[PDB]
Design a protein around this ligand. Structure first.
Ligand SMILES: [Ca+2]
Length: 223
């Protein structure tokens, strides 16, 4: 997250870190046994880390649970990042309390202009590299589909939306991928891609979760 703020320990209780010896992506807990992330975060043999604030220090609310199964969306295209969504099942159920909690799936798609909370452990610099240890947060609006497509001609599908600031300065970034965009208390987006970070007229691009609720629910119901 570039231009954000320190969230506070366990203030984003559905935020998880995907760990394969090191943090490499975010994700969102959507029930006690399932995490939703980006398909471009796929890799074998990872551990899901819940209850994290400082990802390099054991602070006493962590739950570490290995993944039993990954399911990349059946139509994921890594060249275009169309359908950049994946489900991760945990080997055991997380224990849910105020500091570890699931985030509700949307019942409708959030409109441009809705303010949302974006969070992750990704890069905090737009020209340079500095990775934070504690979770960072950004409050940012969904941008119109027209400004999204004008910023990224030929690249925005109906499974994507833009959020952030066309003037730059505030954005998600590398290492935030797979993490949440939460609006009015529901999971509306997944940190997916963008050109650089916090650049002018290159806002963040997010997987449009509301398109995938039927697939998520049916998948969870059979796996
Ligand atoms: Ca920790």
């Amino acid at each position: 997250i570039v231009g954000g703020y320190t969230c506070g320990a366990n203030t984003v209780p559905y935020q998880v870190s995907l760990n394969s010896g090191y943090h490499f992506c975010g994700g969102s807990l959507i029930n006690s046994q399932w995490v939703v992330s980006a398909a471009h975060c796929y890799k074998s043999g990872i551990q899901v880390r819940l209850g994290e604030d400082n990802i390099n220090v054991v602070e006493g609310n962590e739950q570490f649970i290995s993944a039993s199964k990954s399911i990349v969306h059946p139509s994921y295209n890594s060249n275009t990042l169309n359908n950049d969504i994946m489900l991760i099942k945990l080997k055991s159920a997380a224990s849910l309390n105020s500091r570890v909690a699931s985030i509700s799936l949307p019942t409708s798609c959030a409109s441009a202009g809705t303010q949302c909370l974006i969070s992750g452990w990704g890069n905090t610099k737009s020209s340079g590299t500095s990775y934070p240890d504690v979770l960072k947060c950004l409050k940012a609006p969904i941008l119109s589909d027209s400004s999204c497509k004008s910023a990224y001609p030929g690249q925005i599908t109906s499974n994507m939306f833009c959020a952030g600031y066309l003037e730059g300065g505030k954005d998600s970034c590398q290492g935030d991928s797979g993490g949440p965009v939460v609006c009015s208390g529901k999971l509306q987006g997944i940190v997916s891609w963008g050109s650089g970070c916090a650049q002018k007229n290159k806002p963040g691009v997010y997987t449009k979760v509301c398109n995938y609720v039927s697939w998520i629910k049916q998948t969870i119901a059979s796996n």
